[PDB]
Amino acid sequence: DLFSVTFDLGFC
Amino acid sequence: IAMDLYSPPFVYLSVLMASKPKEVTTVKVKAFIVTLTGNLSSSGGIWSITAKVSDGTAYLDVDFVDEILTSLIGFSVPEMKQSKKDPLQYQKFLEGLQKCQRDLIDLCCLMTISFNPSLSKAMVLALQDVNMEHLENLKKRLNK
Amino acid sequence: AGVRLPRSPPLKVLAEQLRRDAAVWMQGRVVMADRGEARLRDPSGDFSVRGLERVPRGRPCLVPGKYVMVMGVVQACSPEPCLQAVKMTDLSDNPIHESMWELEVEDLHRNIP
Structure with a gap:
């Protein structure tokens, strides 16, 4: 059901 | 200049x-x-992200542009649809998909x-x- | 959406440029990689990065001899610049990136007062 090949990021 | x-x-x-x-x-x-x-979208019959x-x-x-994505995944949206009828074809897609993710990581x-x-x-x-x-x-x- | 990054754009900088003179863009060959950290070599010199612990990866394995770009937050310029990896990109695919990189920097620095 879900896709979003998701590479993604934060810092701190 | x-x-x-x-x-x-x-x-x-x-x-x-x-x-x-x-x-x-x-x-x-x-x-x-x-x-x-954002999520990878397939709405409108084409890829977008x-x-x-x-x-x-x-x-x-x-x-x-849908053109880039199709190439990165090796699959069009319609080919995605039919890669269901056949499960072995789905497999091959599922790969193209984390292959896509790898591509964008290293892009x-x-x-x-x-x-x-x-x-x-x-x-x-x-x-x-x-x-x-x-x-x-x-x-x-x-x-x- | 599920993301958070520093307000001003990653700067193309060389080891030396930091070492002599807050969120940056650096490249270099991998000299040593172990767990969450690695030490890189660009034409200027060496620099350490930590926090790879938490960045995305295309290949599961960061090996010496690879060439990569790092978007990082600067840590402690003295005595050899450390970085805090925000994101990292593998350039080993293309032998040019290495050649190009030294210039990529000059050109940016000409073009920003």
């Missing part, structure tokens, strides 16, 4: 901002994807980008992989 409009091999995002274009404009930056700002990219001068939200190169100044966000049209001819373009630009 700072009209980096078409000066090869690529240009800068801050140059474009600083120029403040009246209408839609086409540039090449050599950028990398910072993050993906919002990422935020950068070239060292600015940040930019971009959409992706850094010249991007033909189409900037809309009004509705503010751009849309990536091509991806040129940086070659030795580009390398020599930067030698001359730095007055060597």
